[PDB]
RNA sequence: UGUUUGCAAUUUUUUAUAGUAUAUAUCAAAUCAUCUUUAUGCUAUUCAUGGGUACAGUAUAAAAAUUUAAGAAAUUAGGUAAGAUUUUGUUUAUAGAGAAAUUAGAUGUAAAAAAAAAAUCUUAUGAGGGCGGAUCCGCUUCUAAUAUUUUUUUGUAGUUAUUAUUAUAAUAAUAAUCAUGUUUAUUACUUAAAAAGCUUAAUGGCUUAAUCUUGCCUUACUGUUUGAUUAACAACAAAUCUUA
């Protein structure tokens, strides 16, 4: 009657109680609707049985007998093969235990069940925020022309959670974030991680550019990995670090600064070469995360974001790190009138002048 | 904040509807009553059985 | 007054605060309950399924005489297609005698009457 | 004479007050304002 | 012992442990007033006010309750958040019901899925492009994205059933097909103008909110201050909008 069981009522549960599956509770209607379900699943699997036949027959068929020629046999696979995961999706939806096991976390991502159900939690509020951010907070357009989240990407800065466009301290995000993605699609692939401030002020100019505060590439993900701490990219994981973890700064005066956390998958079999990503970066002070893109051909998978403004603990950041503009303050533009000045109008104002002496009683210290 | 209104439904029993020709089906009702006798109904009623001549 | 008074209870006890609150289920009733909800809907399906593909198989059943009728000639010296345009003639169909009131107003029911069926009706 | 100009008093007792105007066949007003002499919400009420 | 009595199911936080940042448990708060006597009484039976007996999944005697409709009324008008989006009139039908009373109605479409070739601009804080004078400016090629072409096409399945041929299967055609979802479905677009509503006449505006409904509120705040109304009213002043 351990911790390892699960909770006190689960640990008083399960001594009081009898031991019996909970599949076979004798009860009448989830026994009966227990077996209508079962009868189902025997169904949806002898239909995965004619339909992978079905493809074998469509396989072993020279495409010159198709009218359409080899174009009209990969449509028909397509939609053959598409049809079958439906099937197996719809074999296990009505499992009472794998509602079960996904909910408390014990489920395998490496299935397509799991990573249908895991999807359809994602999307129900996590993406709706994330929608927003990108949307509020003008990532679209100015980083990418238009950005659809795939996956789920939640950082923590030093195990506390950070909602998604929160302005962090400058002394809480002073080490590396670590990144809990959880994605949704088959297979293992490579994703680089991309942390551009698109707030660095540019006086100069009188315009913002954009710097790189961190940058990976080269990061094997299957999904049944959670955590990625961006600390150890090289030493523990595998992973070429371009350009180690940069604290965030925001100088006193300028806006809160936007620092982005984009996720960006590699195309199958694509590893960036070591030396190429960190000379990708040399001699460029704006980095662009479309041409970035366009160059290494990668895909925005997940992003996520978390603000910085000058605070307290700003000055001190920059002197250990030895960043330089913290003797920098910005104050606003101010726009004085364009109109020319033009001589005072009215009875009192002409009379003003020690010529109407006089008059003073009328024109002087009027309320 | 739009409200969720909850329904507000009265007690319903199972009964029992015994026609005029003996035949019997089952409705859902808020009635206590439990088998309903119904000595007149449709099909004793010339307008629904025209061709009747027992009631005709 | 006092007969109202016993109207007023009834409403009284419909009011938001006197009726049942919302339910409350542990995780193995309402696991429970799920696949109660879940097969009771793939139940539906089935008899949907079930009930739509009858309906399917009779209408292209329909379909096909009256393609085929359409194309016969005859009977005689009759243009062709004379009884497909006269089947499809909508005569009294939407009138107030369309349908006899006797067949529709039968319906099922759970148990027989005291005679099932009449084999004296005489036209 | 159908409206009356009233006087919301702080509770500060600092002698700041609002005129809001309200019609005779009314309650008293009641309100939670900020009172500049102590820069604070606090609580005003009708003078009378 | 708040939270439904058969068992890690929402979010964040507290604490503890293992652990080297993660993991589980735990705590608090939010969301919600679900009603909680394990029997002490009742019931049947039996035996002398009473003493037993009952053996409980077809659950039970063993708790069916133990000490006067506001969601029927109020036309409440500002800040903020969310939800709803023709509400007017006309017309159709509808016991009492009539010229005149209430109610229900009154557009259509889509929801497996595309890939690919060039061209015409336009944009780009894309290639820190090239050339003149990384970012400014004038020239400019290339890629990318939007738009456009009636352009150039290719594919248009799968599933259920029908028919035809072929040896229950295969092939072809035809019809249907938003649907793993409490059909009252849902979601998106579309539905002339006028009208209704928005403190009050008229004009303009709003339907993607400025209308309506609901939750919490009282910024209908204090001081100073910016730029304007082609330098308010063809001066001044009292005014109107606006910024920090
Ligand atoms: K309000
Ligand atoms: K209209
Ligand atoms: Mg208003
Ligand atoms: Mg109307
Ligand atoms: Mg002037």
Not at chain 1, 336 to 357: C, D, I, N, V
Request: hydrophobic share 35%; proline share 6%; aromatic share 10%.
């Amino acid at each position: 009657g351990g911790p390892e069981l699960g909770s006190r009522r689960r640990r008083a549960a399960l001594a009081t109680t009898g031991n019996l599956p909970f599949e076979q509770l004798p009860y009448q209607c989830f026994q009966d609707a227990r077996k209508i379900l079962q009868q189902d699943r025997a169904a949806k699997i002898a239909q995965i049985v004619k339909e992978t036949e079905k493809i074998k027959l469509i396989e072993a068929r020279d495409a010159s007998e198709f009218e359409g020629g080899e174009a009209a046999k990969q449509t028909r696979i397509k939609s053959l093969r598409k049809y079958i995961e439906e099937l197996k999706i719809l074999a296990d939806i009505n499992d009472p235990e794998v509602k079960r096991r996904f909910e408390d976390g014990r489920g395998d991502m490496t299935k397509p069940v799991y990573r249908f159900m895991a999807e359809r939690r994602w999307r129900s509020m996590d993406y709706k925020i994330i929608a927003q951010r990108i949307s509020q907070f003008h990532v679209v357009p100015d980083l990418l022309p238009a950005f659809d989240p795939t996956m789920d990407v939640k950082l923590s800065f030093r195990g506390y959670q950070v909602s998604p466009g929160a302005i962090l301290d400058s002394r809480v995000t002073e080490v590396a974030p670590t990144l809990r993605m959880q994605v949704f699609d088959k297979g293992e692939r490579l994703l680089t991680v991309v942390v551009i401030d698109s707030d660095v002020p540019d006086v100069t100019h009188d315009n913002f550019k954009r710097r790189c505060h961190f940058l990976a590439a080269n990061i094997p993900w299957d999904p049944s990995k959670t955590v990625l701490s961006l600390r150890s990219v090289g030493d523990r994981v595998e992973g070429d670090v371009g350009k180690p973890w940069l604290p965030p700064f925001a100088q006193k005066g300028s806006p809160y600064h936007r620092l982005n956390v984009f996720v960006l998958e590699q195309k199958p079999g694509a590893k960036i070469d070591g030396e190429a990503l960190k000379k990708h970066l040399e001699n460029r002070e704006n980095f662009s995360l479309k041409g970035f893109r366009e160059k290494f051909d990668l895909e925005p998978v997940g992003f996520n974001l978390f603000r910085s403004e000058w605070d307290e603990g700003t000055a001190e950041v920059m002197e250990r790190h030895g960043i330089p503009g913290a003797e920098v303050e910005f104050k606003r533009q101010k726009f004085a009138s364009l109109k020319p000045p033009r001589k005072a109008r009215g009875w009192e104002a002409k009379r003003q002048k020690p010529k109407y002496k006089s008059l003073w009683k009328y024109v002087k210290r009027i309320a | 904040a739009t409200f969720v209104p909850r329904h507000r439904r009265p007690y319903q029993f199972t009964q029992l509807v015994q026609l005029s020709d003996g035949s019997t089906f089952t409705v859902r009702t808020t009635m206590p009553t439990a088998l309903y006798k119904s000595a007149k109904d449709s099909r004793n009623h010339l307008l629904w059985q025209p061709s009747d001549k027992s009631l005709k | 007054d006092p007969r109202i008074i016993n109207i007023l209870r009834h409403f009284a006890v419909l009011s938001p605060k006197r009726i049942p609150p919302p339910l409350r289920f542990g995780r193995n009733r309402y696991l429970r309950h799920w696949t109660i909800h879940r097969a009771w809907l793939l139940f539906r399906r089935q008899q949907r399924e079930q009930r739509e593909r009858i309906l399917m198989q009779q209408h292209q059943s329909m379909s096909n005489a009256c393609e085929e009728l359409r194309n016969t000639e005859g009977p005689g010296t009759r243009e062709t297609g004379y009884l497909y345009r006269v089947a499809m003639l909508k005569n009294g169909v939407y009138g107030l005698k369309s349908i006899p009131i006797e067949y529709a107003s039968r319906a099922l029911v759970e148990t027989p009457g005291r005679q099932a069926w009449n084999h004296e009706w005489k036209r | 004479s159908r409206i009356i100009n009233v006087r919301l008093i702080s509770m500060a007792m600092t002698g700041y007050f609002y005129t809001f105007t309200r019609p005779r066949t009314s309650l008293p007003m009641s309100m939670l304002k900020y009172d500049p002499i102590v820069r604070r919400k606090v609580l005003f009420l009708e003078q009378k």
